[PDB]
Amino acid sequence: MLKNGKTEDLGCMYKLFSRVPNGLKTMCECMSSYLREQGKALVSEEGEGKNPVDYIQGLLDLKSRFDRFLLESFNNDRLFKQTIAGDFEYFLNLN
Numbered sequence: 001m002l003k004n005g006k007t008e009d010l011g012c013m014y015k016l017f018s019r020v021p022n023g024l025k026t027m028c029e030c031m032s033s034y035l036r037e038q039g040k041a042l043v044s045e046e047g048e049g050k051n052p053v054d055y056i057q058g059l060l061d062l063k064s065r066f067d068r069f070l071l072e073s074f075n076n077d078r079l080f081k082q083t084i085a086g087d088f089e090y091f092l093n094l095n
Contacts (some may be wrong), residue, residue, distance in 0.1 A: 002034055005065065010073035024077065031069070032083040038062055039091040055095075063088060 001009045024043040032047070042058050066084060074080050 002031070002069070003069075007069065007072040010069060014073050020079075028080055028083050031066075031080060032087055035062075035066055035084060035087045036091065039048070039087060040094065043091050043094050059092070 001007075010039070014024075014027070017027060034036070037064065039059065042054050043060065063084075070076055070080055070084065
């Protein structure tokens, strides 16, 4: 449901795993890995050429989806936000 966008499941999972530190750390690792994988898939080559719908603003589409994940389920945790901001700054330069 990080790919299906079912935010209620993400919210319940975060409610479970915020109870113990280093449980949200694995959440950060998985979230940032998924973000980096998808972002480097889009901002880089997509076979032959690039699609501006999913390259110039598709980056923003995914970034908006992931802020929706951060808001509706993660409640804007500082560490998640810092990792995603780092990911954005890193694969924004690989246009």
